[PDB]
Write a protein that binds this ligand. Sequence first.
Ligand SMILES: *[C@@H]1O[C@H](CO[C@H]2O[C@@H](C)[C@@H](O)[C@@H](O)[C@@H]2O)[C@@H](O[C@@H]2O[C@H](CO)[C@@H](O[C@@H]3O[C@H](CO)[C@@H](O)[C@H](O)[C@@H]3O)[C@H](O)[C@H]2NC(C)=O)[C@H](O)[C@H]1NC(C)=O
Ligand SMILES: *[C@@H]1O[C@H](CO)[C@@H](O[C@@H]2O[C@H](CO)[C@@H](O)[C@H](O)[C@H]2NC(C)=O)[C@H](O)[C@H]1NC(C)=O
Ligand SMILES: *[C@@H]1O[C@H](CO[C@@H]2O[C@@H](C)[C@@H](O)[C@@H](O)[C@@H]2O)[C@@H](O)[C@H](O)[C@H]1NC(C)=O
Ligand SMILES: [Cl-]
Ligand SMILES: [Zn+2]
Length: 606
Amino acid sequence: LDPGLQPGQFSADEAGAQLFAQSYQSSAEQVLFQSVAASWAHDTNITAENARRQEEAALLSQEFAEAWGQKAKELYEPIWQQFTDPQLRRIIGAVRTLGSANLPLAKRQQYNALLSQMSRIYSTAKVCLTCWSLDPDLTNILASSRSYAMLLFAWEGWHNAAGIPLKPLYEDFTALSNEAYKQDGFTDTGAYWRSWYNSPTFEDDLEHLYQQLEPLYLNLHAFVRRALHRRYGDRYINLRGPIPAHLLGDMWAQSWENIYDMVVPFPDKPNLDVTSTMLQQGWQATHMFRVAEEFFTSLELSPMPPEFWEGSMLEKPADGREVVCHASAWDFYNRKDFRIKQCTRVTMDQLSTVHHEMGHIQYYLQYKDLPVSLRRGANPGFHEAIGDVLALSVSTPEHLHKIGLLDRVTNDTESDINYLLKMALEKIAFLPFGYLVDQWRWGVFSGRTPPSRYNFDWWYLRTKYQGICPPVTRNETHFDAGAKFHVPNVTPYIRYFVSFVLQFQFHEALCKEAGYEGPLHQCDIYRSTKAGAKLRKVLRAGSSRPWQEVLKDMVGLDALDAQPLLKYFQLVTQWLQEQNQQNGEVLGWPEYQWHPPLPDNYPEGI
Ligand SMILES: *[C@@H]1O[C@H](CO[C@H]2O[C@@H](C)[C@@H](O)[C@@H](O)[C@@H]2O)[C@@H](O[C@@H]2O[C@H](CO)[C@@H](O[C@@H]3O[C@H](CO)[C@@H](O)[C@H](O)[C@@H]3O)[C@H](O)[C@H]2NC(C)=O)[C@H](O)[C@H]1NC(C)=O
Ligand SMILES: *[C@@H]1O[C@H](CO)[C@@H](O[C@@H]2O[C@H](CO)[C@@H](O)[C@H](O)[C@H]2NC(C)=O)[C@H](O)[C@H]1NC(C)=O
Ligand SMILES: *[C@@H]1O[C@H](CO[C@@H]2O[C@@H](C)[C@@H](O)[C@@H](O)[C@@H]2O)[C@@H](O)[C@H](O)[C@H]1NC(C)=O
Ligand SMILES: [Cl-]
Ligand SMILES: [Zn+2]
């Protein structure tokens, strides 16, 4: 470690601890920056040399963490918890958490290489027939093909190509990750991930949320399954069984908005998918980002700085080099550089993703002057919620009309059902997936799911929660969990479930603050400076204060709560119950063992 980055002398008391934290931040920004920069260089240009550089950067970060972590303990271990300044206690708490820096050098090196190799494998996997990439090729097929055999080819090809080679690395990763956090005093990595919510009852609280949300999912599921049955036939759809996992518009069946055009309740009302209009009007990625930015500035939040536009990667590179296409937002910890990396496509769901990512950037812009350790969301679900809240306003037919993407719509009950149904495909269908992913990972980390049951337990959960089944046979050679970005890229997932509940609490609160008095799902907070001020107060707090308190100030309640989401969807929740009863649907999938057969002459789809 460079001398200028090493910790020096400080007194073993609170006053000294303040000075230690100031000294820490000065050097941490340099170390974090070099690490984020090397990660950027790799993820926008995947090569063995860039992985090597990233790995060296990670090693330096680990050296730094260890030196400052050990010094924190040397001076403050018995006293930091009784410090007067709550922000100081939080800073010291973070600094003393070493993570992978607890690993000896040889194991740090294995750990860092595993992360590189898992990232490479996922982001460069291809499906050959001249081969298709996940983004854009397989993504467009899953979104827009209504050919059972083509969808199957893409679903099978992707899961085989990405998942199988990841399995041995993922096992090695898991063991090292656990070894590292065990030395911070956590029984496994999952306990550490969960500790960020600062709640002894986290898992029970989640379960009780999902219990309230499940009926909305069951009804949406049954209604969609009926439509698929009419399209694909009794051979491939079982009206009392799980839906085949390739038919829902998304590689992971995690959100279903891309099959809206197959299930639209009232086809004679306005077309709520504005993708065609975007293309007809000549929208490009840059326009999509500018229109999102303008919504932020309408709220008197910050524009994107010049460094964002100059540094970001907003379209897939045409030199055809290898990149991580999965959308992400980047804080370089120098208070200057902030960037999005997205292989942007010109679609409505991508306009929402643009807002999701820019929500992350706005958080970074608002908390950039807090101590480095506090530059995080109040909890990670908050970070994921910000942009989605704005996107809820944007997606309203009234808002789409204002920005030229939809001829004005009537405000009749059919149009309302169409809209709420399209929104349910995006938000309600996700809920089970958002909840199950980290249930699988927590079980893997805890040892309840060994390698011998990775796929068995993954499909147990996928069926249990989503009511889906693999459309070709799978066995334990397959590692279907590895075919989802967040698994090989070690990004926790429960955040997204928390976010999907939390964003409706936020939405309600900001709509009320904007003085809006109509139905919650027709609220648009555009140009509400009062709403903007209320959101800003959250963003500026970072992780300086307990999230329960930040939430309380914002929404008047100190807990996650499903009622705002239930209120938003009420009309379509009722409509779907009634529709399914009229059709005599079974809610659920009691034929839990059912899987579809292979099509005739599959895979001869020349
Ligand atoms: C689409 O229409 C709905 C329904 O409007 C009905 O009620 C009014 C507006 C009347 O013109 C009638 O013909 C319509 O059928 C609009 O939703 C309603 O919005 C009004 C506010 O404009 C709400 O009134 C307010 O609600 C609460 C009651 O708790 C109070 O805080 C307020 O003082 C006020 O009473 C009303 O509740 C809404 N009705 C329903 C069924 O939700 C909606 O605004 C409109 N949307 C658009 C985009 O035009
Ligand atoms: C992608 O990364 C590679 C490294 O793997 C970059 O290669 C360097 O390119 C520079 C600039 O032209 C050359 O001068 C160096 O000699 C190259 N280094 C190596 C090790 O080959 C490449 O430039 C990157 N591409 C982009 C667009 O950034
Ligand atoms: C696991 O499955 C492997 C390949 O999948 C199989 O063959 C495909 C084409 C389908 O027909 C499907 O029924 C099968 O699952 C097999 O090569 C392999 O033998 C199986 N693995 C183990 C460990 O038994
Ligand atoms: Cl999380
Ligand atoms: Zn996000």
